[PDB]
Amino acid sequence: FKNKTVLKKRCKDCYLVKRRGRWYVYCKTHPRHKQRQM
Amino acid sequence: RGRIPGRQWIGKHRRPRFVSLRAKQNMIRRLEIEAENHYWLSM
């Protein structure tokens, strides 16, 4: 998880999801693509 | 918490002041009176 003010998908497998009040980026193919809205 | 540096209403960093709803209405009421004064001075 890397905090980013602007969340950008890094590949076709990244998908946005709204959880716990802030948007998250999940990517099972690339675990390093995970991001948390700051 | 919430300190405003220096004095409140003077300086570079002043305490913000906001216009209320009745404050707008009071100014509009003043404008309407003066807008009518422009009419009676044109004749």
Binding site: - | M27, I28, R30, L31, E34, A35, H38
Partner: protein, 222 residues
């Protein structure tokens, strides 16, 4: 069946011999021995020059005042040349080289001592002035990607536009003034000295009409 429409052809478009932006020097060739007053009014109010396209079709519109120094030019020059196609794109400078001297005293300077030594040069820019203009065998979407990146690093609020977008932006503001349902406008009150409002206004406010406050330009003000 997916809809198919004709697309414009840029075959007639011609490219100059130097599509890339020319290098910008730190200082002009002739130094200014005499110092100048600050004159902050040179970045205040709407721009009266370089407000229309000359050769290209897309340009970076400046929506505020500011000063461009040698560092700002290098960021724009390096970014645009690398990210553009020399074969089908070209760019020109719509602002002059840094000419206004900026005097900064040495650290530890107390009040007094006269004007400080000249430190660097800047190029004042007013709101509504085009900074960098581009054109050639390219659409607006092709250049909008990195032009917004270049405009984002400018010291003032800027935005990439085209001939159509800029025209539409101006027409939208003209439309807003016409259909505005508010019976009171800044121009009407300021000019007529209603409520004695000119006591807290400025002589420039008679011409700016409330759309300019300091170096900041407000597009939403009618």
């Amino acid at each position: 069946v997916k809809t198919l429409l004709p697309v414009p052809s840029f075959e007639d478009v011609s490219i100059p011999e130097k599509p890339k932006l020319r290098f910008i020097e730190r200082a002009p060739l002739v130094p200014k021995v005499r110092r100048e007053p600050k004159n902050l009014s040179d970045i205040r109010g709407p721009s009266t020059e370089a407000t229309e396209f000359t050769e290209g079709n897309f340009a970076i519109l400046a929506l505020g005042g500011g000063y461009l120094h040698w560092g700002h030019f290098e960021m724009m020059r390096l970014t645009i040349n690398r990210s553009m196609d020399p074969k089908n794109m070209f760019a020109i400078w719509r602002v002059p080289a840094p000419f206004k001297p900026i005097t900064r005293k040495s650290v530890g300077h107390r009040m007094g001592g006269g004007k400080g030594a000249i430190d660097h040069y800047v190029t004042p820019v007013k709101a509504g002035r085009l900074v960098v203009e581009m054109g050639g065998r390219c659409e607006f979407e092709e250049v909008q990607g990195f032009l917004d990146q270049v405009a984002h690093k400018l010291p003032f609020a800027a935005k990439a536009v085209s001939r159509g977008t800029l025209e539409k932006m101006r027409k939208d503001q003209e439309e807003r003034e016409r259909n505005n349902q508010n019976p009171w406008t800044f121009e009407r009150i300021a000019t007529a000295n209603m409520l004695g409002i000119r006591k807290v206004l400025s002589p420039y406010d008679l011409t700016h009409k409330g759309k300019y406050w300091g170096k900041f330009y407000m597009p939403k003000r009618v």
